[PDB]
Nucleic acid binder design. Structure first.
Lengths: 115, 206, 54, 119, 122
RNA sequence: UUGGCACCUCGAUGUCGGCUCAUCGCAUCCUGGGGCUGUAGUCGGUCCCAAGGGUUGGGCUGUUCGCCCAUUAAAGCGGUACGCGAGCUGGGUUCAGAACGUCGUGAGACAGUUCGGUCCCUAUCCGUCGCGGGCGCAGGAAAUUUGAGAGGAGCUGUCCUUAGUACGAGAGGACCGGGAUGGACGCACCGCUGGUGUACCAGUUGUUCUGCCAAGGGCAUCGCUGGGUAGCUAUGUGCGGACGGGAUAAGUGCUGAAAGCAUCUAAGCAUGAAGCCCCCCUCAAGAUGAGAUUUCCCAUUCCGCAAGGAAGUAAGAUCCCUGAAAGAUGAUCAGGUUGAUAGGUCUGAGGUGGAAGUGUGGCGACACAUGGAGCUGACAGAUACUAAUCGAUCGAGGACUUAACC
C-alpha cells in the first residue's frame, strides 16, 4: 500500500532543500504573486515544528516581528518555495517547540551550537 | 455513460502544477472484464456487468465458474452493473483498462460508506443535546417523541440505531491524474469507504 | 414501568422460541473414540491433533 | 485496539507481569482463552530479548520480569533462566513461541480455558 | 475564528485600545470570522486622546488572528493576537497608521489602503 | 383569547415559561408567479395563485407578550391536553418558616410585595428506530438487477458584466440575461490545520522495592508537565440541493359563437410558478400480484398397489475456529493448511528524540563522543515460525389442468 503511495509521488520529492534540524533559526525564500509579478520575500525565524510523512511533511517557521508573533507553515515539497538556508543551527532537547509560542525576550533563545 | 470500478486505499496529497494542493484518493482498478452484456430484448433493460478481483481456486463456486466461462477470462469476486451505457461499443469478455478517463472531466463516485456501529441519537442524526449543567439530567437523548393526542410516534421521527454501512454517492467529482501503467485513478476529493472497499466511478450528469 | 396486563399463556410461550439452546460443536475423539468438542482437548483422551499432552 | 480483560490501566500490566514470570518458571499455565491471546502477543516479545542477550538487552526485561525463584539447588532467578537456557533453546526459530491448547469450560465461571506451552 | 462577545486588541492610533464584537456581517447567523470579514463592534477601551472614544458602535475589519488562513498553497498564516483595524464603514480605514503585521489575505478584497499603510504585509 | 354551560375526569388527567425533537394548516414575513396603481426609474401600496424550503443573535423580565441593540432576503401567524414533566429543568405562582404595608380588638388573612423550599419507575402491549432466526416464493442452491412502493434532498445574499445603458430635468437608477464568489443547513471522510489518543517514547518530584552505586520497578487522579502513531473526530478538507421535461394553477392569450357586433368561450388550440409528476440520490420482491435474466446440480435407494413417506447425497451452506475494513449478541465480512486470515518475526513508514554501557572534560551538578541513536499499542511489507486439527450434521429428486408447438 504505502510503497505504491510514494512510488507515485517520488517524482515530486523536491530534493533541493537542505535537511535541517527541527528547531533552529532559518530563512526561507518564498516566491509569491503580488500584482501578476513574481517576487521573492525572505522569511526569517526559528522552526517550531517538523512533522508529517512522505510528500505531506509540513513544517513551520515562527517569526516574532513588531511584537506580534507570526507563525507560518509550509509543506516541504512545494514549488512555491525557492530557497531555504540554515543561518544558525540549534540544540533543543525537545522536538516540537510549542512552548515558544508564549515566551518572548531572551527566555526564548536557542543557543548556537557551532555547526 | 461509462464507468469502471476499483479498490480504495487511502488519501494522499498531490501537487497540481501550482501551489494548489488537492485531496487525492488512490483508486486502483485492475482491468475489468465484462462478464455479461444484458440486452433489452430479453432482460427488459439496457445494461452491462463488470467484474473486479483476482479470485483464487478455493474461493469460487461452480455457478460463478459457468457464468464466467462463456467469455472465459477469469473468475472475479465483485460483480456490479451499470444501467445506461453505449451497448454498441462493447462485447462480452472485453478487457477495460483505465484508458477511458482523462485528468480533467466531471466524474461521479458512489460507494459503500464506513461503519460507526451502534451509536445513537446525536452522532447518528446530528441533533443537539440539553444543557450539561444547571441541574439538568438530560443530555445525549433523542428529544421528545411527539404530541399527546395521535397516540403514536410518526414514521419519520429519528432515533438511535446503527450509523453507517449504507451505500452513499458523491456527485460531480473530478479526476486529478490518470496513471494507467499501474492501473491507478486519482480523484479530487474525499471518497466514502474504508480501506479496501469498492467504488463505482461513473461520469456524472453535469 | 408497569405491565398493564398479565401475559397470557400464548405470548409467554412465544418468547421461549429464541430462548432455546442448541447442541454445541461436537465431533468424535480420534484416539479414544468418544465424543469430542470441536477444536479443544478430548479430556478422556487427553489428546489434541496427535498428542496426549501431559 | 487491543484487549483490557476486566482490569484497569494499571492492573492489567500488573497482571501480565505475573503471567510471564510464572510462565517462565512453571513452564505451562492454565488461563482462559483471552488471557492466552494476550500472552501469545506479549511473551514472544520477551523471548526475543533472550536472542539479543546483551547488556542493554538485559536491562529491559529486568524492568519487566519479577524476582522469583526458578531453580532451587541453583539459585537461578526467573531473569537468569530467560538468558541462560532459554536463549540456547531458540537460536533457530523465528517467531511463534507459544502454543494455545484450548480446554473446556471452567466450572463456576463458564470461562473458556486454555493451556500455553512454550513451543 | 472570532465569535460574538470576544475582545480584540486594536491595531491603529485612531483612538481605541480594546474592542469587543457584536455580530459578523455574513448571513442570517454566522458563528466565526477568520480574516477579512467585517464586524460591527463596540469600544470597551480607548486612549485618552481619542477621536473615537469609549462606548461607540463601530464597524471594523479583522486583520490578524489566532486563526488559520488556508491559502491554496497549504501555508497557514496564524498570528498570536486577535485584532482589528477600525474602518470608516466602507472599503477604507479611518486611522492614521496600522500597528504591527497585516495578513496578506486582505488583498483578496480591495482594502488596499490598509495594504498601502501596512508596515509588514505578512 | 376574555368568557358563558357544568357533559366526561376529585378510588388523582401534575399547571404557566425556556431547553430537547419537530410535525401540521395558509388568512404569507422572504423567496416564485402575476393584475391594477395616485406603477418615470429604484423602492412601493394592494388584492390573486402559491405551503417545496427558510424563518437570526443578544440586554432586561420567571417570563409569554413587548420595548430595545445589531443584522437579515425574511424575522410569519396559529394549532397539536394554551403540543412535549413514565424526556429535562423548578425561576414562576400554590404547602407550612420569615418579614413589610394595609384589614381585623383577635387567632389570622391578601390574583398586593419580598426571602427559602425532596420532581419518583427496572418497560407488558400498541407505536416507532435499527438489526436478525424460521418458513413462503410447486426442484434445489450461487451472484447481479428491473422496479411496484416509500423516504430524504428540495433556502438563498453580495459582487462583476451588459450598463451608468432605457427612464429621469437632475438626483438617482433598472429590468431581462451571462460569469464569479459566499453565508445557512445536508451527506462524506483523516492526506493538511489542530482535538482525543489510560500496553507509545522523553524529562522530573516524594517514597518504598530489586543487597548497594548505577540502572529500573510500584504507588501517588494516566502522579503531574511537554509531545504523541493508528483509530473515532469538527470548527479542517471535498462535493451536495444541478440542468432540465410533462401537465396545470392565478394570469396572459389567440380563435369564435350563442347574441350580424363585441367576447382569453361551449367546441379547437398555445403559453404560463421556488407549486405538482418524473429527471437527481438513497431504501426496496414477504410487490403472498412473491418479478426478470446468468450458470450449477439432476431425477438417486427404500417402502407402498398407488397416493405418500425417510435417508443417504449433488450444487452449495452451516456448526466450529484465526479474524477484523464489519461488530449490542446474532448478522455482514477476509480465511481455515494448494495459507499470508490473525499473532510473532525481519525490514521499512510515522512518532519520540540523542539509549544504557563505555571513554573523556569537570572539585561536582553536569556536559561530550560512541550515534538521527534508543524504544515503539493497534500501521503495510515480506516469512509457514504459531495456532485456523481432524470431524460433523443440514441440504434436490421435482404435482395437477389446458394451450402451444414438438
Amino acid at each position: 500500500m504505502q510503497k505504491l503511495i510514494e512510488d507515485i509521488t517520488k517524482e515530486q520529492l523536491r530534493t533541493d532543500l537542505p535537511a535541517f534540524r527541527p528547531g533552529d533559526t532559518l530563512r526561507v525564500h518564498v516566491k509569491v504573486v503580488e500584482g501578476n509579478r513574481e517576487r521573492i520575500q525572505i522569511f526569517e525565524g526559528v522552526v517550531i515544528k517538523r512533522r508529517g510523512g512522505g510528500i505531506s511533511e509540513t513544517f513551520t517557521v515562527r517569526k516574532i516581528s513588531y511584537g506580534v508573533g507570526v507563525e507560518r507553515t509550509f509543506p516541504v515539497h512545494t514549488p512555491k518555495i525557492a530557497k531555504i538556508e540554515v543561518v544558525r543551527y540549534g540544540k533543543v532537547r525537545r522536538a516540537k517547540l510549542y512552548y515558544l509560542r508564549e515566551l518572548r525576550g531572551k527566555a526564548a533563545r536557542i543557543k548556537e551550537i557551532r555547526r | 455513460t461509462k464507468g469502471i470500478l476499483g479498490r480504495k486505499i487511502g488519501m494522499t496529497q498531490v501537487f497540481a502544477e501550482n501551489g494548489d494542493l488537492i485531496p487525492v484518493t488512490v483508486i486502483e482498478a485492475a482491468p475489468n472484464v465484462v462478464l455479461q452484456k444484458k440486452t433489452a430484448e430479453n432482460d427488459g433493460y439496457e445494461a452491462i456487468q463488470l467484474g473486479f478481483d483476482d479470485k483464487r481456486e478455493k474461493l469460487s463456486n461452480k455457478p460463478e465458474k459457468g457464468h464466467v466461462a462463456k467469455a472465459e477470462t477469469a473468475p472475479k469476486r465483485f460483480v456490479k452493473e451499470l444501467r445506461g451505457v453505449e451497448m454498441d461499443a462493447y462485447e462480452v469478455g472485453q478487457e477495460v483498462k483505465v484508458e477511458i478517463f482523462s485528468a480533467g472531466e466531471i466524474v461521479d463516485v458512489t460507494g459503500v460508506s464506513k461503519g460507526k456501529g451502534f451509536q445513537g441519537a446525536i452522532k447518528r442524526h446530528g441533533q443537539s443535546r440539553g444543557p450539561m449543567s444547571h441541574g439538568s439530567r438530560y443530555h445525549r437523548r433523542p428529544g421528545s417523541m411527539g404530541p399527546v393526542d395521535p397516540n403514536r410516534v410518526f414514521k419519520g421521527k429519528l432515533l438511535p440505531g446503527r450509523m453507517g454501512g449504507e451505500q452513499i454517492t458523491v456527485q460531480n467529482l473530478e479526476i486529478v491524474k490518470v496513471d494507467a501503467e499501474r492501473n491507478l485513478l486519482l480523484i479530487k476529493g474525499n471518497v466514502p469507504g474504508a480501506k479496501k472497499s469498492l467504488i463505482t466511478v461513473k461520469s456524472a450528469v453535469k | 414501568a408497569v405491565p398493564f396486563r398479565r401475559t397470557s399463556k400464548m405470548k409467554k410461550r412465544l418468547r421461549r422460541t429464541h430462548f432455546k439452546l442448541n447442541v454445541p460443536g461436537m465431533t468424535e475423539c480420534p484416539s479414544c473414540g468418544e465424543m469430542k468438542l470441536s477444536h479443544r482437548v478430548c479430556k478422556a483422551c487427553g489428546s489434541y491433533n496427535g498428542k496426549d499432552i501431559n | 485496539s487491543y484487549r483490557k480483560l476486566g482490569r484497569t490501566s494499571a492492573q492489567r500490566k500488573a497482571m501480565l507481569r505475573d503471567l510471564t514470570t510464572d510462565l517462565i518458571i512453571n513452564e505451562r499455565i492454565e488461563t482462559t482463552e483471552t488471557r492466552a491471546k494476550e500472552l501469545r502477543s506479549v511473551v514472544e516479545k520477551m523471548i526475543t530479548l533472550g536472542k539479543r542477550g546483551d547488556l542493554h538487552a538485559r536491562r529491559q526485561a529486568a524492568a519487566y520480569i519479577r524476582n522469583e525463584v526458578a531453580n532451587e539447588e541453583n539459585n537461578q532467578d526467573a531473569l537468569q533462566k530467560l538468558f541462560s537456557d532459554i536463549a540456547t533453546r531458540y537460536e533457530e526459530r523465528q517467531g511463534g513461541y507459544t502454543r494455545i491448547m484450548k480446554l473446556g469450560p471452567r466450572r463456576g465461571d463458564g470461562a473458556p480455558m486454555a493451556i500455553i506451552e512454550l513451543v | 475564528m472570532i465569535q460574538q462577545e470576544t475582545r480584540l486588541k486594536v491595531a491603529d492610533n485612531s483612538g481605541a485600545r480594546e474592542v469587543l464584537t457584536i455580530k459578523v456581517l455574513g448571513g442570517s447567523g454566522r458563528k466565526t470570522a477568520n480574516i477579512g470579514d467585517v464586524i460591527v463592534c463596540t469600544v470597551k477601551q480607548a486612549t485618552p486622546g481619542g477621536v473615537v472614544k469609549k462606548g461607540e458602535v463601530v464597524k471594523a475589519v479583522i486583520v490578524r488572528t489566532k486563526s488559520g488562513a488556508r491559502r491554496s498553497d497549504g501555508s497557514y498564516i496564524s498570528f498570536d493576537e486577535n485584532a482589528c483595524v477600525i474602518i470608516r464603514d466602507d472599503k477604507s480605514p479611518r486611522g492614521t497608521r496600522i500597528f504591527g503585521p497585516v495578513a496578506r489575505e486582505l488583498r483578496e478584497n480591495n482594502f488596499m489602503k490598509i495594504v498601502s499603510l501596512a508596515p509588514e504585509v505578512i
